[PDB]
């Protein structure tokens, strides 16, 4: 399921600002 | 509000009323900021409330009130070395001069040796994202509750000519009514043409920002459609483990929305998710209204929203003041303020 394929990533917690 | 209910449109005049007289007020303290309104030795500095890259947000408590508020510490040598002095002089300046019920309160504002210090209000119930994430997804109505809060706080900044460019779930916070407080104004710039900075978070992005294209405003209104999208689905309409793999991702524009979506939230999606800048909900000749009028939002008063008379979804479990259950915890590390005055020119106007 794509919820599963979510929990299973590296981006499901705290994500931070970016800039150049 | 009575007459928005009692004849749809007839509120636009007192609207755009409304609307002259908060950038009146918002002119006033754009062009004379506040300046040095409160000092370190004032707080008891209780526990970080969150982390980021150039410094944290701390739970204080003010001595001579017992207020508490939340107060975020910037390292001026690290905003210096990442090239970031510019957005860091937008953020406290536009922070300190707009008034929303939406948007986090700044109370003081001062610096010293080391670093830069912006107190707000503390918003005690957490980050949408701590209860999104817990409870997975939020229901149609719960979304649209929140969702409203942001048309209505973008249809502010927009008309003071002010861009976001931070909208998410992290930067979203719970107040004791349930209602938003929208925080981190680390993007936000004041800008009547088109700008270019790459700065957001990647899977908030829209694509004109992604392809060095030069943007407006209506990146904004892109990351609200991912707003909604990922309070109603659970997850964000495009992700990954790597942020060039979203990039990858968003210019496709290709988006897939969960079997359970209504169909009038399938439809205001591909219209704020919309690659094409003639297309986009938000930023075409009707602006706002197209998103205020599209039929996910036709149970939304929008003038009961404004004014908080809305029962809220749910309210955060709140134990006492100073409170922090609604919050992860953090390491602690000791703030050092050195002898030596650090980049005392780059931020005189702070
Ligand atoms: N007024 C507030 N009350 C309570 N908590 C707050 C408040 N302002 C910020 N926070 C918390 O502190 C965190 C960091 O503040 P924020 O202003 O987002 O910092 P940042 O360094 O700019 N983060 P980012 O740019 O999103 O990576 C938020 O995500 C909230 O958890
Ligand atoms: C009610 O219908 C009477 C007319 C209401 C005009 C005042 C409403 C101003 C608040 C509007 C929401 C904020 C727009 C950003
Ligand atoms: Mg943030
Ligand atoms: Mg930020």
Same mark, same amino acid.
């Given at each position: 399921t794509t919820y599963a394929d979510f929990i299973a990533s590296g981006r499901t917690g705290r994500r931070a600002s970016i800039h150049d | 509000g009575n007459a928005?209910?009692?004849?749809?449109?007839?509120?636009?005049?007192?609207? &755009?009323?409304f609307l002259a007289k908060a950038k009146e007020?918002?002119?006033?303290?754009?062009?004379?900021?506040?300046? $040095?309104?409160?000092? *370190?030795?004032? @707080?008891?500095?209780?526990?970080? *409330?969150?982390?980021?890259?150039?410094?944290?947000?701390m739970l204080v408590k003010h001595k001579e009130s017992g207020n508490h508020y939340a107060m975020?510490?910037?390292?001026?040598?690290?905003?210096? &070395? *990442?090239?970031?002095?510019?957005?860091?002089?937008?953020?406290?300046?536009?922070?300190?001069?707009?008034?929303?019920? =939406?948007?986090?309160?700044?109370e003081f504002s001062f610096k010293d040796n080391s670093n830069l210090y912006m107190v707000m209000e503390y918003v005690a119930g957490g980050e949408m994202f701590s209860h999104l994430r817990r409870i997975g997804r939020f229901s149609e109505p719960h979304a649209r509750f929140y969702a409203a809060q942001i048309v209505l706080?973008?249809?502010?900044?927009?008309?003071?000519?002010?861009?976001?460019?931070?909208?998410?779930?992290?930067? *979203?916070?719970?107040?004791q009514q349930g209602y938003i407080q929208v925080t981190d104004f680390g993007f936000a710039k004041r800008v009547k043409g088109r700008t270019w900075t790459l700065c957001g978070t990647p899977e908030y992005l829209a694509p004109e920002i992604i392809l060095s294209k030069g943007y407006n405003k209506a990146?904004?209104?892109?990351?609200?459609?991912?707003?909604?999208?990922?309070?109603?689905?659970?997850?964000?309409?495009? @992700?990954?483990?790597?942020?060039?793999?979203?990039?990858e991702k968003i210019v496709s524009?290709?988006?897939? =929305?969960?079997?359970?979506? %209504? %169909?009038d939230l399938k439809d205001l999606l591909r219209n704020l998710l919309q690659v094409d800048l003639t297309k986009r909900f938000g930023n075409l000749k009707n602006g706002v209204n197209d998103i205020k009028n599209?039929?996910? @939002?036709?149970?939304?008063?929008?003038?009961?929203?404004?004014?908080?008379?809305?029962?809220?979804?749910?309210?955060?479990?709140? &134990?006492?003041?100073?409170?922090?259950?609604? =919050?992860?915890?953090?390491?602690?590390?000791?703030?050092?303020?050195?002898? $030596?005055? &650090?980049?005392?020119?780059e931020f005189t106007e702070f």
């Open positions: - | 928005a209910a009692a004849c749809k449109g007839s509120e636009q005049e007192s609207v &755009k009323e007020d918002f002119l006033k303290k754009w062009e004379t900021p506040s300046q $040095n309104t409160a000092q *370190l030795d004032q @707080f008891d500095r209780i526990k970080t *409330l969150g982390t980021g890259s150039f410094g944290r947000v975020k510490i910037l390292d001026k040598q690290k905003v210096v &070395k *990442l090239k970031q002095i510019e957005h860091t002089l937008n953020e406290k300046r536009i922070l300190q001069a707009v008034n929303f019920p =939406f948007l986090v309160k700044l706080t973008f249809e502010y900044l927009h008309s003071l000519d002010l861009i976001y460019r931070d909208l998410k779930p992290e930067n *979203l916070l719970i107040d990146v904004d209104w892109w990351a609200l459609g991912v707003l909604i999208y990922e309070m109603a689905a659970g997850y964000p309409p495009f @992700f990954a483990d790597q942020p060039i793999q979203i990039y524009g290709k988006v897939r =929305f969960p079997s359970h979506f %209504s %169909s599209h039929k996910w @939002f036709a149970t939304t008063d929008w003038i009961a929203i404004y004014q908080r008379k809305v029962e809220a979804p749910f309210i955060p479990k709140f &134990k006492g003041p100073g409170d922090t259950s609604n =919050f992860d915890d953090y390491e602690e590390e000791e703030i050092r303020v050195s002898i $030596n005055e &650090k980049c005392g020119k």
